[PDB]
Design a protein around this ligand. Sequence first.
Ligand code: GPM
Ligand code: CA
Length: 448
Amino acid sequence: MTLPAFKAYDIRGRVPDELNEDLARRIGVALAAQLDQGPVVLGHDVRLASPALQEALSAGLRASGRDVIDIGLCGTEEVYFQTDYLKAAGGVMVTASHNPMDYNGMKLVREQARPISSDTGLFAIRDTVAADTAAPGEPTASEQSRTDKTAYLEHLLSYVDRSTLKPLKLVVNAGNGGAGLIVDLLAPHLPFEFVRVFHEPDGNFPNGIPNPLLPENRDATAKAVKDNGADFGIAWDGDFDRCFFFDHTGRFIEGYYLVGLLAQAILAKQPGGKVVHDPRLTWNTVEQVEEAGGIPVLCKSGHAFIKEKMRSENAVYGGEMSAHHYFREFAYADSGMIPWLLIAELVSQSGRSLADLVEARMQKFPCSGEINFKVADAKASVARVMEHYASLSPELDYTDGISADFGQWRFNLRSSNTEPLLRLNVETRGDAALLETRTQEISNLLRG
Ligand SMILES: O=P(O)(O)C[C@H]1O[C@H](CO)[C@@H](O)[C@H](O)[C@H]1O
Ligand SMILES: [Ca+2]
């Protein structure tokens, strides 16, 4: 067969069956043969296995003559930023994002933090590793320990005018992932009062997997916000490349509406910029980008596609409805920290709550949120939906699965590139009853 840990965008597996130290080391040797010249930046997340996997990966790399720069415990965006900042040949983050306790993985980038996908070298690494039968060589290169985050921190703060910031009260929920360490390093430079929930890094995840979409993690943050009268709350996944917002009532804000709002914040600083967005949910983003003088640029979802469209278009900002936010000045990479700094500045400067900033957008373009399906025949399921609606003549688009625009409502339906699921997203023009009917009706066609 082929190695199962090698997914489309990255390496995800169960330790030690699909991913282990010998596989990691072999990945190190194979990566040395794919990169242009320069050192390799390594980082890892809080998971229990992640240091041992990094040590193995460093050994394979140094056996093949690449210097390693170990930046230690970190979030995924720091490997991206440090790879670009230090002009390294590439970087590797050991992490399993939001996945179960027995999982780990790796995200790989080349120069300027460009992603390595199955498309673009990750499957060439897989093939090399699959065949590499050789014995581990000895380290012929060094490992430098570069744990200082000053440049990263200074970079993050540069997005906001610190003298316009009000002493807002913010709940932060790191889910025992790694985000609280960055918060605690920024706190001395910010006027905010932080209310820290599930703050300490703990790879045993005592309070559960860092995944804010799970209702127990959701309710922990929503409750902290109401109990403390915070202005809003922020929660991250384990490696904090995803950021989720809660308004002052404790209400979870669908990542879709943050794309348009962050867009407007950015185009206030860089007028006439291009903004990259995905096709799942579109109408609110397009109108807000245009209202702000920007240019909306549609792109297939998935972080490797977004980053490339942004480079090739010189887009100032890009956003997915799955809580990934991308910034040109951040090596065209995603950050889970920049978003909430931008929102904090917006609230401070406008005198508006986060709830009021999004309220009218949510009523103007209600959406279903992402709904996932395991079905028997994904093709036959999709066929049934298209059959049922063909007599209404929807405008179709195949940029990313199927988008069907009916005028007053639309949906996107697409297979996942990382799970064997169908993902559904629906939205209407200010009609919540139509939203519910069409979402139930489509759900029925899918399952039946
Ligand atoms: O499983 P999917 O939908 O193909 C890909 C999923 O993970 C990616 C990487 O975190 C995200 O960029 C994407 O928006 C998300 O839907
Ligand atoms: Ca993540």
